[PDB]
Design a protein around this nucleic acid. Structure first.
Lengths: 62, 65
DNA sequence: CGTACG
DNA sequence: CGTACG
């Protein structure tokens, strides 16, 4: 769970209104974008995050 | 070169398969014992270079063109 | 579930 | 280039 909480903690420390990219999260958290994404898409299905469609997608606390 | 070996192993498996016949990167991966990802890398490469023909689908089919 | 992508 | 994929 280390990552899930870690990602939310970051998105919480960066304004509930401001989004962000997985790549962004990766470079800031020192973690593989692939793992970042699985974590992100999961939180999104759980409805914990808000995925903003597009290329690339944008993530922000729900 | 390992990369070229795998390229050749792919070309040989499809030449033996039969020019008009095709198969998935999955079968290719299981038969040559190489992760499906790498197979796809060589496959799209060889396709780019016209040596192989991709038959769109889910999943795609590959054959010697 | 297609994914090839580095 | 969107890729999360076991």
């Amino acid at each position: 769970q280390d990552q899930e909480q870690r990602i939310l903690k970051f998105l919480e420390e960066l304004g509930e209104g401001k989004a962000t990219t997985a790549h962004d999260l990766s470079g800031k958290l020192g973690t593989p974008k692939k793992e970042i994404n699985r974590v992100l898409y999961s939180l999104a299905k759980k409805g914990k995050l808000q995925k903003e469609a597009g290329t690339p997608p944008l993530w922000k606390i729900a």
